[PDB]
């Protein structure tokens, strides 16, 4: 774990991708986290907005919701702030937590969204996101990051996840 990069996961992106594409499937977050834990990663942060603790509704379907609170108790998942004002949901943008933490910790970002609004705000964030984004596919419960996260000539996935190539 000493030579490994910190891992920051877009929890909502991963939960939408897993299972039914239109359902927030929390087992998907668990499966991604487990993929990194089994490789020895000890520094993993999953960000999810706090309002995903609300009860399942027809326009916000969720499965295995209890996973979120459990991962929070394990200090793997962190809720980003959300509240109500005058009956309206006021949500802090979780993408900024994800990018800022990965950037300040010299880590990698697990997400199929490449955050072009934040990239266009700060040139250093654009360069960081473009170099440190880990996209992925699920096949059922199989979490499959690409072995070539930066294409043909980039690092192997093994070396992408390390601080110093081995
Ligand atoms: Na889903």
mmCIF file of C-alpha atoms and ligand atoms in Angstrom:
data_model
loop_
_atom_site.group_PDB
_atom_site.id
_atom_site.type_symbol
_atom_site.label_atom_id
_atom_site.label_comp_id
_atom_site.label_asym_id
_atom_site.label_seq_id
_atom_site.Cartn_x
_atom_site.Cartn_y
_atom_site.Cartn_z
ATOM 1 C CA UNK A 1 0.000 0.000 0.000
ATOM 2 C CA UNK A 2 2.992 2.288 0.496
ATOM 3 C CA UNK A 3 3.601 2.611 -3.249
ATOM 4 C CA UNK A 4 -0.110 2.874 -4.175
ATOM 5 C CA UNK A 5 -2.048 5.926 -5.252
ATOM 6 C CA UNK A 6 -5.041 7.106 -3.202
ATOM 7 C CA UNK A 7 -8.327 6.104 -4.861
ATOM 8 C CA UNK A 8 -11.315 8.483 -5.094
ATOM 9 C CA UNK A 9 -14.564 7.011 -6.476
ATOM 10 C CA UNK A 10 -17.600 8.773 -7.986
ATOM 11 C CA UNK A 11 -20.079 6.628 -6.065
ATOM 12 C CA UNK A 12 -23.182 7.809 -7.925
ATOM 13 C CA UNK A 13 -21.620 7.156 -11.349
ATOM 14 C CA UNK A 14 -20.645 3.606 -10.304
ATOM 15 C CA UNK A 15 -24.071 2.845 -8.742
ATOM 16 C CA UNK A 16 -25.900 4.050 -11.843
ATOM 17 C CA UNK A 17 -23.623 1.934 -14.061
ATOM 18 C CA UNK A 18 -24.127 -1.318 -12.098
ATOM 19 C CA UNK A 19 -27.281 -3.395 -12.435
ATOM 20 C CA UNK A 20 -30.206 -1.610 -14.051
ATOM 21 C CA UNK A 21 -28.820 1.425 -15.837
ATOM 22 C CA UNK A 22 -31.694 3.537 -14.444
ATOM 23 C CA UNK A 23 -31.311 2.394 -10.798
ATOM 24 C CA UNK A 24 -28.843 3.558 -8.115
ATOM 25 C CA UNK A 25 -27.431 0.069 -7.419
ATOM 26 C CA UNK A 26 -25.360 0.283 -4.234
ATOM 27 C CA UNK A 27 -23.830 -3.184 -4.622
ATOM 28 C CA UNK A 28 -21.914 -1.647 -7.528
ATOM 29 C CA UNK A 29 -20.096 0.658 -5.104
ATOM 30 C CA UNK A 30 -19.256 -2.294 -2.878
ATOM 31 C CA UNK A 31 -17.951 -4.308 -5.848
ATOM 32 C CA UNK A 32 -15.659 -1.482 -7.054
ATOM 33 C CA UNK A 33 -14.327 -0.892 -3.542
ATOM 34 C CA UNK A 34 -13.658 -4.621 -3.113
ATOM 35 C CA UNK A 35 -11.744 -4.661 -6.395
ATOM 36 C CA UNK A 36 -9.305 -2.085 -4.986
ATOM 37 C CA UNK A 37 -9.111 -3.599 -1.490
ATOM 38 C CA UNK A 38 -8.111 -6.986 -2.859
ATOM 39 C CA UNK A 39 -5.150 -5.399 -4.661
ATOM 40 C CA UNK A 40 -3.882 -3.928 -1.376
ATOM 41 C CA UNK A 41 -5.260 -0.386 -1.588
ATOM 42 C CA UNK A 42 -5.778 1.057 1.895
ATOM 43 C CA UNK A 43 -6.701 4.668 0.997
ATOM 44 C CA UNK A 44 -10.123 4.626 -0.716
ATOM 45 C CA UNK A 45 -12.817 7.331 -0.573
ATOM 46 C CA UNK A 46 -16.280 7.025 -2.166
ATOM 47 C CA UNK A 47 -18.253 10.277 -2.367
ATOM 48 C CA UNK A 48 -22.077 10.144 -2.533
ATOM 49 C CA UNK A 49 -24.567 13.034 -1.898
ATOM 50 C CA UNK A 50 -26.322 12.842 1.469
ATOM 51 C CA UNK A 51 -29.763 12.969 -0.136
ATOM 52 C CA UNK A 52 -29.236 9.393 -1.374
ATOM 53 C CA UNK A 53 -30.148 8.430 2.204
ATOM 54 C CA UNK A 54 -33.717 9.529 1.358
ATOM 55 C CA UNK A 55 -36.333 6.831 0.803
ATOM 56 C CA UNK A 56 -36.532 5.239 -2.647
ATOM 57 C CA UNK A 57 -38.983 7.037 -4.972
ATOM 58 C CA UNK A 58 -40.094 6.343 -8.567
ATOM 59 C CA UNK A 59 -37.758 9.006 -10.024
ATOM 60 C CA UNK A 60 -34.857 8.027 -7.714
ATOM 61 C CA UNK A 61 -34.867 4.228 -7.467
ATOM 62 C CA UNK A 62 -32.190 2.684 -5.236
ATOM 63 C CA UNK A 63 -31.289 -0.896 -4.260
ATOM 64 C CA UNK A 64 -29.399 -2.141 -1.188
ATOM 65 C CA UNK A 65 -29.423 1.348 0.347
ATOM 66 C CA UNK A 66 -28.112 0.058 3.686
ATOM 67 C CA UNK A 67 -24.707 -0.439 1.995
ATOM 68 C CA UNK A 68 -24.153 3.330 1.994
ATOM 69 C CA UNK A 69 -24.436 3.772 5.761
ATOM 70 C CA UNK A 70 -22.299 0.686 6.333
ATOM 71 C CA UNK A 71 -19.557 1.968 4.058
ATOM 72 C CA UNK A 72 -19.754 5.278 5.892
ATOM 73 C CA UNK A 73 -19.185 3.532 9.202
ATOM 74 C CA UNK A 74 -16.186 1.794 7.669
ATOM 75 C CA UNK A 75 -14.752 5.264 6.725
ATOM 76 C CA UNK A 76 -14.787 4.328 3.053
ATOM 77 C CA UNK A 77 -17.836 6.317 1.973
ATOM 78 C CA UNK A 78 -18.241 10.033 2.708
ATOM 79 C CA UNK A 79 -21.524 11.871 2.166
ATOM 80 C CA UNK A 80 -21.295 15.262 0.516
ATOM 81 C CA UNK A 81 -23.625 17.895 2.035
ATOM 82 C CA UNK A 82 -27.278 18.196 1.065
ATOM 83 C CA UNK A 83 -30.169 19.873 2.893
ATOM 84 C CA UNK A 84 -33.590 21.466 2.447
ATOM 85 C CA UNK A 85 -34.382 25.184 2.222
ATOM 86 C CA UNK A 86 -37.999 26.265 1.832
ATOM 87 C CA UNK A 87 -39.006 22.757 0.771
ATOM 88 C CA UNK A 88 -36.331 22.644 -1.941
ATOM 89 C CA UNK A 89 -33.340 20.340 -2.011
ATOM 90 C CA UNK A 90 -30.061 22.307 -1.920
ATOM 91 C CA UNK A 91 -27.221 20.012 -3.010
ATOM 92 C CA UNK A 92 -23.500 20.718 -2.918
ATOM 93 C CA UNK A 93 -21.845 19.431 -6.088
ATOM 94 C CA UNK A 94 -20.121 16.125 -5.326
ATOM 95 C CA UNK A 95 -17.932 16.346 -8.440
ATOM 96 C CA UNK A 96 -15.923 19.155 -6.839
ATOM 97 C CA UNK A 97 -15.241 17.046 -3.717
ATOM 98 C CA UNK A 98 -14.112 14.161 -5.912
ATOM 99 C CA UNK A 99 -11.770 16.246 -8.064
ATOM 100 C CA UNK A 100 -10.403 18.366 -5.223
ATOM 101 C CA UNK A 101 -9.623 15.382 -2.975
ATOM 102 C CA UNK A 102 -7.983 13.375 -5.764
ATOM 103 C CA UNK A 103 -5.953 16.439 -6.820
ATOM 104 C CA UNK A 104 -4.794 17.403 -3.334
ATOM 105 C CA UNK A 105 -3.930 13.754 -2.505
ATOM 106 C CA UNK A 106 -2.144 13.007 -5.829
ATOM 107 C CA UNK A 107 -4.582 10.139 -6.446
ATOM 108 C CA UNK A 108 -6.781 8.693 -9.188
ATOM 109 C CA UNK A 109 -10.478 9.298 -9.962
ATOM 110 C CA UNK A 110 -12.827 6.354 -10.670
ATOM 111 C CA UNK A 111 -15.565 7.744 -12.913
ATOM 112 C CA UNK A 112 -16.921 7.392 -16.449
ATOM 113 C CA UNK A 113 -17.709 11.135 -16.378
ATOM 114 C CA UNK A 114 -14.706 13.351 -17.127
ATOM 115 C CA UNK A 115 -16.021 16.548 -15.446
ATOM 116 C CA UNK A 116 -15.565 19.036 -18.314
ATOM 117 C CA UNK A 117 -17.081 21.978 -16.391
ATOM 118 C CA UNK A 118 -14.494 21.629 -13.596
ATOM 119 C CA UNK A 119 -11.741 20.939 -16.159
ATOM 120 C CA UNK A 120 -12.561 24.209 -17.877
ATOM 121 C CA UNK A 121 -12.510 26.115 -14.579
ATOM 122 C CA UNK A 122 -8.830 25.427 -13.701
ATOM 123 C CA UNK A 123 -6.167 24.323 -16.250
ATOM 124 C CA UNK A 124 -4.358 22.299 -13.581
ATOM 125 C CA UNK A 125 -7.564 20.318 -12.941
ATOM 126 C CA UNK A 126 -8.040 19.663 -16.661
ATOM 127 C CA UNK A 127 -4.518 18.220 -16.933
ATOM 128 C CA UNK A 128 -4.956 16.204 -13.700
ATOM 129 C CA UNK A 129 -8.359 14.758 -14.702
ATOM 130 C CA UNK A 130 -7.097 13.878 -18.165
ATOM 131 C CA UNK A 131 -4.086 12.016 -16.700
ATOM 132 C CA UNK A 132 -5.703 10.413 -13.623
ATOM 133 C CA UNK A 133 -9.214 9.345 -14.734
ATOM 134 C CA UNK A 134 -10.000 5.637 -14.464
ATOM 135 C CA UNK A 135 -13.027 4.671 -16.560
ATOM 136 C CA UNK A 136 -14.507 1.150 -16.253
ATOM 137 C CA UNK A 137 -17.160 -1.298 -17.400
ATOM 138 C CA UNK A 138 -19.324 -3.703 -15.382
ATOM 139 C CA UNK A 139 -20.266 -7.142 -16.678
ATOM 140 C CA UNK A 140 -23.000 -8.158 -14.206
ATOM 141 C CA UNK A 141 -21.113 -8.120 -10.848
ATOM 142 C CA UNK A 142 -17.661 -8.076 -12.519
ATOM 143 C CA UNK A 143 -15.902 -4.708 -12.167
ATOM 144 C CA UNK A 144 -13.556 -4.361 -15.187
ATOM 145 C CA UNK A 145 -11.241 -1.332 -15.339
ATOM 146 C CA UNK A 146 -9.243 -1.163 -18.604
ATOM 147 C CA UNK A 147 -5.685 -2.410 -18.605
ATOM 148 C CA UNK A 148 -4.910 0.600 -20.869
ATOM 149 C CA UNK A 149 -6.534 3.512 -19.015
ATOM 150 C CA UNK A 150 -4.643 6.095 -21.083
ATOM 151 C CA UNK A 151 -4.738 4.178 -24.365
ATOM 152 C CA UNK A 152 -2.260 2.107 -26.356
ATOM 153 C CA UNK A 153 0.902 3.925 -25.323
ATOM 154 C CA UNK A 154 0.017 4.921 -21.760
ATOM 155 C CA UNK A 155 0.890 3.098 -18.554
ATOM 156 C CA UNK A 156 -0.401 -0.328 -17.710
ATOM 157 C CA UNK A 157 -3.245 -0.324 -15.192
ATOM 158 C CA UNK A 158 -0.809 -1.924 -12.714
ATOM 159 C CA UNK A 159 1.542 1.048 -13.004
ATOM 160 C CA UNK A 160 -1.279 3.636 -13.259
ATOM 161 C CA UNK A 161 -2.340 2.676 -9.737
ATOM 162 C CA UNK A 162 1.199 2.932 -8.275
ATOM 163 C CA UNK A 163 3.106 6.019 -7.168
ATOM 164 C CA UNK A 164 6.335 4.735 -8.774
ATOM 165 C CA UNK A 165 6.219 2.344 -11.776
ATOM 166 C CA UNK A 166 7.641 -1.064 -10.853
HETATM 167 NA NA1 LIG B 1 -27.578 1.133 -11.946
#
